[PDB]
Design a protein around this motif. Structure first.
Motif, mmCIF file in Angstrom:
data_model
loop_
_atom_site.group_PDB
_atom_site.id
_atom_site.type_symbol
_atom_site.label_atom_id
_atom_site.label_comp_id
_atom_site.label_asym_id
_atom_site.label_seq_id
_atom_site.Cartn_x
_atom_site.Cartn_y
_atom_site.Cartn_z
ATOM 1 N N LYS A 389 0.827 -1.202 0.000
ATOM 2 C CA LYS A 389 0.000 0.000 0.000
ATOM 3 C C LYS A 389 0.863 1.255 0.000
ATOM 4 O O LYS A 389 0.593 2.205 -0.744
ATOM 5 C CB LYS A 389 -0.939 -0.013 1.208
ATOM 6 C CG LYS A 389 -1.793 1.239 1.346
ATOM 7 C CD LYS A 389 -2.891 1.062 2.383
ATOM 8 C CE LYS A 389 -3.984 0.130 1.883
ATOM 9 N N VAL A 393 1.375 4.118 -3.360
ATOM 10 C CA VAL A 393 1.383 5.578 -3.363
ATOM 11 C C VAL A 393 2.660 6.090 -4.014
ATOM 12 O O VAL A 393 2.631 7.014 -4.838
ATOM 13 C CB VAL A 393 1.219 6.114 -1.927
ATOM 14 C CG1 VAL A 393 1.396 7.628 -1.889
ATOM 15 C CG2 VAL A 393 -0.143 5.721 -1.367
ATOM 16 N N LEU B 86 1.999 0.382 10.619
ATOM 17 C CA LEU B 86 1.821 1.594 9.825
ATOM 18 C C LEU B 86 3.162 2.138 9.352
ATOM 19 O O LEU B 86 3.336 2.453 8.170
ATOM 20 C CB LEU B 86 1.074 2.653 10.639
ATOM 21 C CG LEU B 86 0.918 4.020 9.965
ATOM 22 C CD1 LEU B 86 0.075 3.907 8.703
ATOM 23 C CD2 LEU B 86 0.317 5.037 10.926
ATOM 24 N N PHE B 89 5.053 -0.437 6.605
ATOM 25 C CA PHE B 89 4.639 -0.493 5.208
ATOM 26 C C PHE B 89 4.751 0.860 4.519
ATOM 27 O O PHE B 89 4.797 0.907 3.285
ATOM 28 C CB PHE B 89 3.213 -1.052 5.094
ATOM 29 C CG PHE B 89 2.120 -0.021 5.213
ATOM 30 C CD1 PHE B 89 1.741 0.743 4.120
ATOM 31 C CD2 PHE B 89 1.438 0.148 6.405
ATOM 32 C CE1 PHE B 89 0.729 1.682 4.225
ATOM 33 C CE2 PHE B 89 0.420 1.084 6.513
ATOM 34 C CZ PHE B 89 0.066 1.850 5.421
ATOM 35 N N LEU B 90 4.803 1.958 5.276
ATOM 36 C CA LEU B 90 5.032 3.269 4.681
ATOM 37 C C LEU B 90 6.508 3.552 4.438
ATOM 38 O O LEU B 90 6.830 4.532 3.759
ATOM 39 C CB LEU B 90 4.433 4.365 5.566
ATOM 40 C CG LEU B 90 2.903 4.448 5.583
ATOM 41 C CD1 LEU B 90 2.439 5.506 6.575
ATOM 42 C CD2 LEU B 90 2.342 4.740 4.193
ATOM 43 N N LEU B 155 2.792 10.307 3.954
ATOM 44 C CA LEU B 155 2.744 9.062 4.679
ATOM 45 C C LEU B 155 4.092 8.406 4.520
ATOM 46 O O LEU B 155 4.673 7.954 5.509
ATOM 47 C CB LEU B 155 1.567 8.212 4.155
ATOM 48 C CG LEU B 155 0.158 8.757 4.458
ATOM 49 C CD1 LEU B 155 -0.896 7.861 3.837
ATOM 50 C CD2 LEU B 155 -0.085 8.899 5.955
ATOM 51 N N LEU B 205 -0.525 7.968 12.939
ATOM 52 C CA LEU B 205 -1.182 8.854 11.982
ATOM 53 C C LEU B 205 -0.793 10.309 12.219
ATOM 54 O O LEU B 205 -0.538 11.056 11.265
ATOM 55 C CB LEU B 205 -2.701 8.691 12.068
ATOM 56 C CG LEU B 205 -3.343 7.533 11.299
ATOM 57 C CD1 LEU B 205 -4.847 7.542 11.521
ATOM 58 C CD2 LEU B 205 -3.023 7.607 9.811
ATOM 59 N N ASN B 209 0.586 11.715 8.734
ATOM 60 C CA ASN B 209 -0.569 12.105 7.936
ATOM 61 C C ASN B 209 -0.591 13.589 7.574
ATOM 62 O O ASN B 209 -1.607 14.067 7.062
ATOM 63 C CB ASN B 209 -1.861 11.746 8.676
ATOM 64 C CG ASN B 209 -3.006 11.437 7.732
ATOM 65 O OD1 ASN B 209 -2.948 11.752 6.541
ATOM 66 N ND2 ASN B 209 -4.055 10.815 8.259
ATOM 67 N N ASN B 318 -5.424 13.582 10.617
ATOM 68 C CA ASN B 318 -6.708 12.922 10.412
ATOM 69 C C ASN B 318 -6.713 11.570 11.115
ATOM 70 O O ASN B 318 -5.775 10.784 10.937
ATOM 71 C CB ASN B 318 -7.004 12.734 8.923
ATOM 72 C CG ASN B 318 -8.403 12.202 8.673
ATOM 73 O OD1 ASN B 318 -9.381 12.945 8.745
ATOM 74 N ND2 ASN B 318 -8.506 10.911 8.378
ATOM 75 N N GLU B 418 -3.630 4.738 -4.805
ATOM 76 C CA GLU B 418 -3.960 3.851 -3.687
ATOM 77 C C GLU B 418 -5.316 3.173 -3.896
ATOM 78 O O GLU B 418 -6.305 3.456 -3.219
ATOM 79 C CB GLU B 418 -3.945 4.608 -2.356
ATOM 80 C CG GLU B 418 -3.802 3.688 -1.153
ATOM 81 C CD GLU B 418 -4.794 3.995 -0.049
ATOM 82 O OE1 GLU B 418 -5.089 5.188 0.185
ATOM 83 O OE2 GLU B 418 -5.283 3.036 0.585
ATOM 84 N N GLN B 422 -7.395 7.483 -3.349
ATOM 85 C CA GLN B 422 -6.865 8.838 -3.496
ATOM 86 C C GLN B 422 -6.994 9.296 -4.948
ATOM 87 O O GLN B 422 -6.018 9.644 -5.616
ATOM 88 C CB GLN B 422 -5.414 8.892 -3.022
ATOM 89 C CG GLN B 422 -5.154 8.133 -1.728
ATOM 90 C CD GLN B 422 -3.799 8.450 -1.116
ATOM 91 O OE1 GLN B 422 -3.161 9.434 -1.472
ATOM 92 N NE2 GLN B 422 -3.361 7.615 -0.184
ATOM 93 N N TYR C 284 -11.392 10.265 -1.639
ATOM 94 C CA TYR C 284 -10.903 11.642 -1.623
ATOM 95 C C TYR C 284 -11.768 12.567 -2.468
ATOM 96 O O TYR C 284 -12.000 13.720 -2.086
ATOM 97 C CB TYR C 284 -9.455 11.697 -2.104
ATOM 98 C CG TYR C 284 -8.445 11.178 -1.106
ATOM 99 C CD1 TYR C 284 -8.836 10.404 -0.021
ATOM 100 C CD2 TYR C 284 -7.096 11.474 -1.244
ATOM 101 C CE1 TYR C 284 -7.914 9.935 0.885
ATOM 102 C CE2 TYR C 284 -6.169 11.006 -0.340
ATOM 103 C CZ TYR C 284 -6.588 10.240 0.720
ATOM 104 O OH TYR C 284 -5.679 9.764 1.624
ATOM 105 N N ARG C 287 -14.358 13.214 0.267
ATOM 106 C CA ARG C 287 -14.002 13.661 1.606
ATOM 107 C C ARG C 287 -13.094 14.884 1.581
ATOM 108 O O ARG C 287 -13.120 15.685 2.521
ATOM 109 C CB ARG C 287 -13.343 12.507 2.363
ATOM 110 C CG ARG C 287 -12.949 12.816 3.794
ATOM 111 C CD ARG C 287 -12.863 11.532 4.614
ATOM 112 N NE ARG C 287 -11.944 10.546 4.036
ATOM 113 C CZ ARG C 287 -10.708 10.300 4.471
ATOM 114 N NH1 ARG C 287 -10.202 10.960 5.503
ATOM 115 N NH2 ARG C 287 -9.970 9.379 3.867
HETATM 116 C C1 LIG Z 1 -0.813 4.663 2.334
HETATM 117 O O1 LIG Z 1 -1.079 4.264 3.651
HETATM 118 C C2 LIG Z 1 -2.125 4.938 4.298
HETATM 119 C C3 LIG Z 1 -3.265 5.299 3.597
HETATM 120 C C4 LIG Z 1 -4.293 5.964 4.244
HETATM 121 C C5 LIG Z 1 -4.179 6.273 5.591
HETATM 122 C C6 LIG Z 1 -5.318 6.999 6.300
HETATM 123 C C7 LIG Z 1 -5.851 8.077 5.768
HETATM 124 C C8 LIG Z 1 -6.995 8.780 6.493
HETATM 125 O O2 LIG Z 1 -6.964 8.899 7.747
HETATM 126 O O3 LIG Z 1 -7.969 9.232 5.835
HETATM 127 C C9 LIG Z 1 -3.044 5.912 6.295
HETATM 128 C C10 LIG Z 1 -2.015 5.247 5.647
#
Ligand SMILES: COc1ccc(/C=C/C(=O)O)cc1
Lengths: 627, 625, 627
Positions: A389, A393, B86, B89-90, B155, B205, B209, B318, B418, B422, C284, C287
């Motif tokens: 994931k 991105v 979290l 993987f980021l 992220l 987050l 974020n 967020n 994603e 997104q 998105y 939101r």
């Molecule tokens: C790419 O990994 C990710 C993707 C989305 C999120 C959360 C987003 C949110 O709070 O709307 C967090 C990590």
């Protein structure tokens, strides 16, 4: 027969694109580059541009000396501070501090090699000794410092090669280990016999007049572009394997009927990968990938021949025609072939990247990837494993910036030098943006390739665990339910393993649900009184067996061996996993996707992906399968 | 009556752009950057992003501790391994070897600072202790290594700040001297006690974020862009000075009648330089229309600044933790559209500024348009062995072309990302990177143009001295050999550098208009040859002596620049930095002189002399007539 | 207090963007445009540019005559073939045949209006009579023919207005009905007293020196852009309604904490729509739509003030300063504010289009649209109704071309006119590409708006048929199964109607499947012996009832009325459906999506969407809901 040389240019576009890459890689790895002024190739430019200690050296053909000395002697007969002035006022570049404004030293080496080969034809009136001196600099890896910017295609950057040759006080050079060297020190370490050169007439122009810097980097760029294109062809096929896509999209009839040779080769290459594979409709990133890549390959190949002609050209002015006893004034310094080819290549590189992003997007999406887990999650717990994931991105960020670089440079020409240069090619600038685009495509290639190997392992996991579920379901049905046991296993056949395997006996997942439905269907046609027992026995045995099978697979003792081992695409997988050590990405370990990406990206930068790539096609006859 | 906050934004755009730059500079130099989540400026981001030993430190306002602890406690009271996943993987970025694929550490420091400020409002639900640790990393210049690419606007790059805080094995940090450090070593040098942080819910987050990386660097870029905008204004006036252009193009009426404030301030800034010029005693568009051209560019840059200054004081987290209503608010403040928009618009404005500099530079070095200055601004006695800025002029075109290329936007290349969650994203940081690239290229054009202007100044100094010399000896040969009033008028009209390299050359004008002059008075002849023989024998000696005197530092007429309001920049380039008058009779090349100015410019040393050119300006145009 | 006029410019950016649009629409529809040289707005430019017979007329303020006659008399006192020559050699445009190379006549009218207002200040030295003559041309809709190209911002195009005023032999004009007119005929039909003008000194320059053509079209463009932006804000809210998205994305806390006023207004506008609506996480395009549109609105609004200042400026040269008794030479003809504002607006228009494409993509995708049918199919048979699938491709083609137009024009400046115009703004060219971008956004707005109304009707169909299924399922369960009847209806609650309704009793669809599962679950806790009966009765009754309910709905007699009728967004729906006649798109009828698109797109071009749009917010207090 060929007065305008269209014919001989056409003769160079015959044969398969792969064969050219094969030959290209072959002469890249030759130990000696012999310059005669007519046979320089981008692979030789690239091989020399490398500062990785390959051992490659440059040799100047003595067959060219006679022509070089003739034009030089002609200028002296027709006739020195003007040469000193030319180099002084062209030293107008800006280095500042650091390397952000300095030309990459490998790009300087490319320019130096091309600068020699374009002066060996003998029409430039420069002493052979100077050509020999630049060769020493290459062979001993002594590189003058050139500015990154200051050229509209290369008076300014090339003048910093002349500044080193004449011992200018501001001239600096870098050693094999990054040491800053003065002109005197550079001469001593390179073995240049004698002192600094006192440039004779036309010798200053011979050095600064030319397109060597742009064409030199364009050669480095197109060497990597030709590899990455083939790598895109093969990865599209590997992509179709793990996606379990319909292989008839490579059928030669489809592509033969378009006549586009690049499309026909691309489809034939993919057909060859799939034809030796042990593995509503398919989407476009898969089904139209030959149509999509064909033109991109035709562009990179055609652009390659433009540059190769440029690096074997006489791009200085005036031309000393000894045969006619007169200097010829012209405009061969106008590097239009560089800007056009790099602008066209940059767009093709972006088209390749767009397809890769589209393919990667399909692979990591459980709606489209035909059973693979979302994000290619590899752990027992999908809630603590989000796999690629984060990489997905990044791929979007790679692709987006690639589409920005796809814009041209050559539509931003300025009327320059008191409007004397009212047209100019901007070649080097374009080569610089196309180099940036290649490096991003390397980032995309690294990430995409590791994902395919993840998907491969997941397919190996799917087959093993789908067999474990079958055996346990059959073992429990034979115990309890005694046409009903045959339909129970068909459910296991139809359901995607990774839709329930993280908890095989969850009443909310499709395994236990669709198993019960099959029992109810038969009961209506006492089969109903045994449902409760069947689900109790399965709940007790299946979780233990699934875990046992996964550990055996993780322990290297799978009940069913990884089918990739018998695929024509195995070398690339073997290279990523076995040779490089790229590990299965799972949320149960601490290793991050980036750490695995480093290994492939670093090796890809060292050219280590060329062999496993070509080995995937080494048994291809260069023709499509009969229709 | 400002419910939607339009008016607060409009109140920020009052007063002159210069006053805003003067305040911006002055705040850059304050020794302490105190963060309160509401008052962070780009000047503070720039000053902290610098790794130059300036000593600037970061303080956290204790007043924000309560709100921060409130949302942090609320999350824990609402309830680990997910926070470890979290960050793992980021960590999907690629560094490779070298630094080509690594975010500049200055940009990383900027991101760290903005990251802290956007968490102090109390709506992010993160422990204050973590914010204190990042502050130590900044004040100790311990910078985590972030990847250059991998985000769609953070992220991924922001996960490597978190990777350092949690002690990830692949996490790497660099020290003040470039020494690579482990997460354990980083904490030691930084002074962070207690060991690595075990992130609590939402803290992962909270850290990743935000839009801190994109916004963090747009602040660095915008700081440089605001200064270069004023530099372009001042240099346009100096360009109009050495060009001897009609100062009428700065008349306030022309610009009052267009209303555009950027054009009005620009015209007024150049008017201040020209109104206090000692040279005071049609033009082409690069000169006569520069206020119209630069005006809109400064408005975009100033507008873009306020957008980013709101972003770096925003809450891009967020979900938001609202303790007053006892719930988390899910939204999309991480969408960094303000970054991509402001950076795309600013990059186009930077390109327009660069385009004007190229056109001006072209006029200044072309003998057809520069009103008597030598072609290429050659400074040597033998123009056949001195081509001055001909190579620099070519570089200017290369600088300009690449800038028009970079002028293209980034935000029109959005990909559905994603798994199409997104389906829109800002690409802010990518745009910040390209605008930063456009800014550095404009620094190359400003360095080259600025040194070029000082050359033109010294060439006007040489012209006046040698114009006086030719007049004098012409009157000597006239009084002794002989008419005079017209012969002396020839010298004033004719351009020096059209004949000065060989004054008595028969093919050159001075020794030709005097003949035509004497013949005209005769026709309305026997004294011509004697006067010429007398001038031919005397003029080379007198010219060479006055030119040598000027070279030794004792000219007849002193350089008038010393009595101009534009002197500070000339004094800085030519005197403080040591830049030298370029001439083909020496071996020094233009680049060598450009180096001195570009390095000084890269370290902010141009700011002081720049603002000093306008120190006495009251911030208003002088009255009509 | 405000010597550089930053303050008065800032004072114009106060208040909500909507209020400006409300005022903008108000003065657009005023019957008279009075030019005083200081108060011209884009709405007045737009109102005049229209050739739709609105009746709007132009009046010249007599308060300005004194200043106009003064500067004119000043030039005559200071002092004619030079004026004849100026107009001749500037007539260098190319019309060819047809209208592909002619400036749109509405754009010519915009240029004419601005050209007058910029000459009324009195600093241009042109006879008031000429300003009065151009006013007659506007009021009688007599438009000279101007070339589309030939200007870098407008000597050439403006000279064709002067060519009509001086009776040039090549000058042509168009009548209210498209009739080609000679200069003599044009004067006769417009009522211009007297013959052709003999241009006095500076009068030629006063007419051709200026940015009126670029600024005039920029005004037309920004009028439509301000409406379409508000239309984007409202449609994002309507989008959230039919998507059943979480409305807390409009919560003022979120946006208040970013301080971005455009974002805060956009979220407050959407909040107001959703706060009066009768209807893992959201994606998105939904939101983050306030974050996405905020800056775009801030750009269009800021760009609007740049142009409005330009159309009230003196952009000719030299300026005749009677007070000082001297002509002032300058460069107010440099139309940089036009190019910058149009380049920035074009990008914002493309950002708006990208969000709309993203939103439309979510709406027509059954994976993301929260129960609506894929493609928004409206027929009983999904295999013979693909709904908006064809429109979805068109949206991609619209968006793609929009992102291409987002590139700037002002980075392509050429050193022009013997390098005297070494910088130029290219304003009109930029206005032309931004106009093209608006029209494409209108294509996207048309298609997206009709899709929302389709989705609305489908939500109305979902509620009615979900109730019909409930009643039949309950009626059959009460008959046959007598906690079990309460769980059966919960299934109907959870399942998306359009996942089974095309064949309610198909054993392969989720209705009959999940209904059976619920019975089996209870039987295990004779409930099993009655399953066969339950499915027989339901198979006999449910298809008939579903069809009956759908016909009653299609016949205008729904059991549950369309909830949109009580939504604040009802006016837009009422406008598309009731007022325009846009019909529900179903594969059982022959009507194609394009035919419905014509109605909305045509009306949108006639400005007919302004009222229903603004009526959706007419009760908004201009402030967010308290937090
Ligand atoms: C790419 O990994 C990710 C993707 C989305 C999120 C959360 C987003 C949110 O709070 O709307 C967090 C990590």
């Amino acid at each position: 027969e060929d007065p305008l040389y269209w014919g001989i240019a056409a003769e160079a576009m015959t044969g398969s694109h792969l064969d050219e890459v094969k030959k290209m890689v072959a002469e890249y790895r030759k130990p000696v580059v012999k310059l005669g002024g007519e046979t320089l190739t981008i692979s030789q430019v690239a091989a020399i541009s490398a500062r990785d200690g390959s051992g490659v050296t440059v040799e100047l053909s003595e067959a060219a000396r006679a022509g070089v000395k003739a034009s030089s002697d002609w200028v002296m007969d027709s006739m020195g501070a003007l040469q000193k002035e030319l180099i002084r006022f062209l030293n107008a570049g800006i280095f500042g501090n650091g390397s952000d404004n300095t030309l990459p030293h490998s790009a300087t080496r490319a320019a130096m090699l091309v600068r020699i080969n374009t002066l060996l034809q003998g029409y430039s009136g420069i002493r052979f000794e100077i050509l020999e001196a630049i060769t020493k600099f290459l062979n001993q890896n002594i590189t003058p410092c050139l500015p990154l910017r200051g050229t509209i295609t290369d008076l300014v950057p090339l003048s910093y090669i002349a500044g080193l040759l004449t011992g200018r006080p501001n001239s600096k050079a870098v050693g094999p280990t990054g040491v800053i060297l003065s002109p005197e020190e550079a001469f001593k370490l390179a073995g240049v016999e004698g002192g600094f050169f006192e440039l004779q007439p036309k010798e200053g122009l011979a050095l600064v007049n030319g397109t060597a810097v742009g064409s030199g980097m364009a050669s480095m760029v197109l060497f990597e572009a030709n590899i990455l294109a083939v790598l895109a062809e093969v990865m599209s096929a590997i992509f179709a394997e793990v996606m379990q896509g319909k292989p008839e999209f490579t059928d030669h009839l489809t592509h033969k009927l378009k006549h586009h040779p690049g499309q026909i080769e691309a489809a034939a290459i993919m057909e060859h990968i799939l034809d030796g594979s042990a593995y509503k409709q398919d989407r476009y990133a898969l089904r139209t990938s030959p149509q999509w890549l064909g033109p991109q390959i035709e562009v990179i190949r055609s652009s390659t021949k433009m540059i190769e002609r440029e690096i074997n050209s006489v791009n200085d002015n005036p031309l000393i025609d000894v045969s006619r006893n007169k200097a010829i004034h012209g405009g061969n310094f106008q590097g239009t072939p560089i800007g056009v080819s790099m602008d066209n290549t940059r767009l093709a590189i972006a088209a390749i990247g767009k397809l890769m992003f589209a393919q990667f997007s399909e692979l990591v999406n459980d709606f489209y990837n035909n059973g693979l887990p979302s994000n290619l999650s590899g752990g027992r717990n999908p809630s603590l494993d989000y796999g690629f994931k984060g990489a997905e991105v990044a791929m979007a960020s790679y692709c987006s910036e690639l589409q920005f670089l796809a814009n041209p440079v050559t539509n931003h020409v300025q009327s320059a030098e008191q409007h004397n240069q009212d047209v100019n090619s901007l070649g080097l600038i374009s080569s610089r943006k196309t180099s940036e685009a290649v490096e991003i495509l390397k980032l995309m290639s690294t990430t995409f390739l590791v994902g395919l190997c993840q998907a491969i392992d997941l397919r190996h996991l799917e087959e093993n665990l789908k067999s474990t579920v079958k055996n346990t379901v059959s073992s429990v049905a034979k115990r309890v339910l005694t046409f009903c046991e045959k339909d129970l296993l068909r459910v296991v056949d139809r359901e995607y393993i990774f839709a329930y395997i993280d908890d095989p006996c969850s009443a909310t997942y499709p395994l236990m649900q669709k198993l019960r439905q099959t029992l109810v269907e038969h009961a209506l046609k006492s089969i109903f009184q045994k449902i409760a027992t069947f689900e109790d026995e399965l709940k007790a045995l299946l979780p233990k067996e699934v875990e046992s099978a996964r550990a055996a697979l993780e322990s290297g003792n799978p009940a069913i061996p990884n089918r990739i081992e018998e695929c024509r695409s195995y070398p690339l997988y073997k290279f990523v996993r076995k040779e490089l050590g790229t590990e299965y990405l799972t949320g149960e370990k601490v290793t991050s996707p980036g750490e695995e990406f480093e290994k492939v990206f670093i090796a890809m930068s060292k050219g280590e992906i060329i062999d496993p790539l070509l080995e995937s096609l080494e048994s291809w006859n260069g023709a499509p399968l009969p229709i």
